């Protein structure tokens, strides 16, 4: 039922095994949807949707691809050059995420967060390096050093606050026929692993819904069964979602219960499934 901003972000996952070996994984996402892939071997962007280039011309797309190719190349070489000085022990890993998100009010917020060992390392606020407390002395050292490279900071500032917001608005409009659609879920009931001797687990499966906000609850007519355990909203390959809502009940206190499903695509016709 919960919903946040609509964001476009590029992610990076770099594994530094030894001083001569490093591997980077990168992709481009519009929320949970992958719109970009990166072929690390050829050093090119893979457009996974016909609208993945947004409203950006073939020249501007080839310029950004070149920026990211030089970056992915340079990043592993620069970390391996600076690891000695930063006192890095092999093996270690790095993660990065950068992009921008549209909020209610037309306010687009741009972001860039880095990680070291799955822990926060840095963030970008007002085109500036903000070291994370988790990063330690290493994050403070990283931010104090990266400032000295004005060309890098300028390129990061252009990308985050100029290229991104207009790329986002362009990709949202270019893919509105895919982004702006209603897909109805299907719902079924089953029985789950016994939570005890005189206990039952009633499972309610909800699948094939788009967009992501959903409401699922076990009911006794109109009586909301408060002990309903809500699972995670899991993906389906076909840009739909899966969710299962369970309920632990005594053998007899399950006789008159049902499952009610609320979704934006159902046009007010909630799915109700009686236990039976």
């Amino acid at each position, epitope marked *: 039922a919960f919903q946040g901003p609509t964001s476009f972000h590029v992610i990076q996952t770099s594994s530094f095994t030894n001083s001569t070996w490093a591997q980077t994984q990168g992709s481009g996402w519009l929320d949970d949807l992958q719109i970009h892939g990166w072929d690390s071997d050829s050093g090119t962007a893979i457009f996974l949707k016909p609208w993945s280039k947004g409203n950006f011309s073939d020249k501007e797309v080839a310029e950004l691809e070149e920026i990211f190719r030089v970056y992915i190349f*340079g990043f592993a070489r*620069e970390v391996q050059d600076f690891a000695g000085d930063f006192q890095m022990k092999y093996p270690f890993e790095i993660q990065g995420i950068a992009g921008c998100e549209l909020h209610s009010g037309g306010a687009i917020v741009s972001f860039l967060r880095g990680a070291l060992g799955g822990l926060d390392f840095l963030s970008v606020k007002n085109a500036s390096c903000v070291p994370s407390p988790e990063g330690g002395s290493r994050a403070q050292k990283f931010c104090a050093l990266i400032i000295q490279y004005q*060309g890098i900071m300028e390129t990061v500032r252009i990308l985050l606050y100029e290229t991104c917001p207009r790329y986002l608005l362009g990709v949202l409009n270019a893919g509105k026929a895919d982004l702006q659609r209603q897909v109805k879920p299907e719902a079924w009931l089953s029985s789950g692993p016994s939570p005890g001797p005189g206990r039952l687990q009633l499972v309610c499966h909800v699948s094939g819904f788009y967009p992501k906000p959903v409401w699922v609850m076990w009911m006794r007519g109109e009586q909301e069964q408060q002990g309903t355990q809500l699972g995670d909203i899991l993906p389906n390959a076909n840009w739909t979602w899966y969710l299962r809502a369970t309920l632990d009940v005594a053998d007899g206190e399950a006789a008159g219960l049902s499952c009610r499903v609320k979704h934006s695509s159902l046009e007010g016709q909630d799915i109700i499934l009686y236990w039976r």
Partner: T-cell receptor
Amino acid sequence: GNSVTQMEGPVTLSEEAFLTINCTYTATGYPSLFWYVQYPGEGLQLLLKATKADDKGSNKGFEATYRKETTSFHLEKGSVQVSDSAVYFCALTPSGGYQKVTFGTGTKLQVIP
Amino acid sequence: AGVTQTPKFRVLKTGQSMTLLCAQDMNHEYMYWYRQDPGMGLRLIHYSVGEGTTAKGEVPDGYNVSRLKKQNFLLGLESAAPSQTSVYFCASSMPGLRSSYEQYFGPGTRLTVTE
């Protein structure tokens, strides 16, 4: 859309004269600046460089300060030697050296004894 | 011994083919092929950002390149023309923020294409 603009043509100077080879550039960003020297019958070689604005390159009596405001990298020497007879190329590349270098046409220096 | 070039000098008939070899045992990632003519200055033909990768420069027509091994940058002339009469210089560099990323040039190769 980078460019390098250096001194128009050949420059003849007597031994121990003050040398000035003007160089200005046009670039977007924070590029690095270089001076390459090409001796007769030889290839080009770095004379000096200044990786960031206000840096000062110094080699073989020659010097050049990277002035971002006047978008310049003027070459200077207090007392030119006869061995300074060469072509001087002003150069530019984005910082990091991950992209191509932009050279000026080169200035010929003739130090007469 | 830094950047070396073979041949040092060559005279070709129009239509004849040749290969210029450039080698560097400095472990440099980048390699470049230029030609130098009076009044024109240095003009890039082709360049390589790493072993297996090549790209076109300012004056690439009439020339082909290859980077099979990181050490060498091969420049080819498939059909020599009199316009290809020039002094050819190879350069190599090592990118990196702390690297001494200047270009290192070879001695030159004089080529003359006669009818």
